[PDB]
Structure 1
Amino acid sequence: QCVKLNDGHFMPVLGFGTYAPPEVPRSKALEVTKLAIEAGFRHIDSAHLYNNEEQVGLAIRSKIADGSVKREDIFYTSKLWSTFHRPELVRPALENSLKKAQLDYVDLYLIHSPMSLKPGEELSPTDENGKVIFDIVDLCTTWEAMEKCKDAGLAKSIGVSNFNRRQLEMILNKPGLKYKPVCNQVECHPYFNRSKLLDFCKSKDIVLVAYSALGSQRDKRWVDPNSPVLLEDPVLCALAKKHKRTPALIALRYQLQRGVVVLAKSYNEQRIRQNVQVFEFQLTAEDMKAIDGLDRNLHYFNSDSFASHPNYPYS
């Protein structure tokens, strides 16, 4: 149920997604993270952006305090937001995340996105046209600051998120590189299966971690409502009926069988418990081929607000 990372640490292959939109009360993250741990999730995925680290941290601490788990059993991820790419801002951002969560270390700290944004108070500083205001930061310098965070023990492991192959290559080719990224957390599901990126990551012993593996929460800010709904896909439905599982379970199992670590967000008690059933069945080669056939280059995150950023990872 774990994969060995390229720095010798271990990552559970199923992770719990903690993002919920602002309209969902902050207190819910506390409740559902406890439910996730109770159901068997041990990998928990958060970020500064999600405005939930206090609640997620409290959930972890509560399950440690009542004896359900030990800290060493939990794999907790947070992420560096894009207004903190300048190297001097990296360690303070991580220290803030640790203070929020009331943890001594994170298991994993990621650069959330390659798209650097103007430093300041706003999460999303935008111009009068609605395009976020970019910053030019050499991400190799950001990476050196992340490495210093690992050396200080603030993060057990470091990685990246939303990097394309070229962007990942730039880090890997850095002169004097101390630590490779352990992972690249990216949008990955049957409509956008990232086969070429997956092959590249495998070739470099970098784990691909899939987000929006169940087709995203379809947030109106970023996602076209016309886009096909992943879990309504007829092929996934047919496979669910064949196996007497659910389309969600088929989508998660697909990723595990490709060697991809998979996240799953649910704030519903029944679905949280359902999602751990991914370890209870297998897909055949013909099933996997059928799912591979769904690939359509559909990144659900698809907005003008970021598509004009100089470091936008999609072509």
Structure 2
Amino acid sequence: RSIMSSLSITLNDGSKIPWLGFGTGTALYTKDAEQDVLRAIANGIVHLDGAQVYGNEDSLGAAIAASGKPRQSLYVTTKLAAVPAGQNVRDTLVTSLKKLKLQYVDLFLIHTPEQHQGNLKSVWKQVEELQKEGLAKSIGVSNFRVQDLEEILDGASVVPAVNQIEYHPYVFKADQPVIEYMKKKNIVPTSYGGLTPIVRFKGGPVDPVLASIASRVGTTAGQSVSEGQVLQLWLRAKGIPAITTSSKEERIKEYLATETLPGLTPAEVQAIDEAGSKAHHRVFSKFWD
């Protein structure tokens, strides 16, 4: 499996980002983070999502090196945290690249606008220069509201390629404005937290809908399909890359299956939209509310 051999989404700069990703997330121990990345790579996930702030870039780089998979087969994202005192954005990326043991990242994101209040335009210009310098192939943002995007786009030479956000049926209704804005600017959303409805809020209104659709998709595919896999197919139907976090090979194998399971129909996506819209559950980036 490689970026080329995998389902991918085309970004506004021409590059392809694999639809299925795996993130080290907020993994507490770097020893676990490394093993989970190795498991993700071994099972065929070719999109790896890291972040400065949680300190797991060393594990991500060690796992890439230990996997035996060519780095050029993989798409690597990392994310700008706060700029340490006496440094600039470039400094953090050079530090990230040394930890990742890479010459460039495929994608460099501003992790959150809350860490750059009053300096958003300055930070984005610096990230634009890092793309010119060859250190980040594509550049984007994370957890940016419409207003935040408006700010950095005012006088920008590069439109962010992605906005990585919490995205699942229980934020669907609240996120409709930013989703519409991004589609007008050709910013691709990428989702984290895609399993939130059933991991954190099992028993809400989306569950019977997911159960019904999983039965349908399963009969079309000739294999058992879980409610979690339908939540990813919902993202796939919208063209939104899914960043996952499960450590377990059995769940990782399920994620992989959703790359090629039969797609959801319009009525099925609509039904999930509607059921999700009966409840708002935002787990991360509460400043959005």
User: Structure 1-normalised TM-score?
Assistant: 0.80
Give, in angstroms, the shift of residue 73 of structure 1: 1.8
Matched residue, 1:114: 113
Matched residue, 1:101: 100
Identity of counterpart residues, as a percentage? 33
Aligned residues: 272
**Residues in 2 aligned to 1:196 and 1:61: alpha-carbon distance in whole angstroms:** 41
Long gaps (5+) in structure 2? 1-6, 219-224
- Whether the 8 Å contact between 2:206 and 2:272 is mirrored in structure 1 is no
Long gaps (5+) in structure 1? 118-135, 219-224
Superposed structure 1 runs of 4+ greater than 6 Å apart? 229-232
**Residues in 2 aligned to 1:56 and 1:70: alpha-carbon distance in whole angstroms:** 14
Matched residue, 1:234: 208
Q: Measured at CA, do residues 107 and 231 of structure 1 come closer, stay the same or move farther in structure 2, by a change above 3 Å?
A: farther
Q: Measured at CA, do residues 240 and 272 of structure 1 come closer, stay the same or move farther in structure 2, by a change above 3 Å?
A: same
Tell me, yes or no, if structure 1 residue 284 matches structure 2 residue 272: no
Tell me, yes or no, if structure 1 residue 298 matches structure 2 residue 281: yes
Is the partner of 2:233 in helix, strand or coil?
helix
Cα deviation digits, residues 18-71 of structure 1 (max 9, x gap): 11442xx321222221221122211111101222111111111223xx3xx322
Matched residue, 1:33: 37
Matched residue, 1:124: none
Give, in angstroms, the shift of residue 86 of structure 1: 8.2
Tell me, yes or no, if structure 1 residue 137 matches structure 2 residue 118: yes
**Residues in 2 aligned to 1:137 and 1:213: alpha-carbon distance in whole angstroms:** 31
Over aligned residues, Cα RMSD in angstroms? 2.4
Give, in angstroms, the shift of residue 5 of structure 1: 1.4
Matched residue, 2:221: none
Matched residue, 2:168: 189
- Whether the 8 Å contact between 1:18 and 1:46 is mirrored in structure 2 is yes
Matched residue, 2:247: 267
**Residues in 1 aligned to 2:198 and 2:60: alpha-carbon distance in whole angstroms:** 19
- Whether the 8 Å contact between 1:39 and 1:273 is mirrored in structure 2 is yes
User: Structure 2-normalised TM-score?
Assistant: 0.86
**Residues in 1 aligned to 2:80 and 2:284: alpha-carbon distance in whole angstroms:** 19
**Bigger share in helix:** 2
Matched residue, 2:88: 89
Q: Measured at CA, do residues 232 and 21 of structure 1 come closer, stay the same or move farther in structure 2, by a change above 3 Å?
A: farther
Tell me, yes or no, if structure 1 residue 172 matches structure 2 residue 153: yes
Is the partner of 2:247 in helix, strand or coil?
coil
Q: What amino acid maps onto 1:30 in structure 2?
A: E
- Whether the 8 Å contact between 1:85 and 1:142 is mirrored in structure 2 is no
Matched residue, 1:127: none
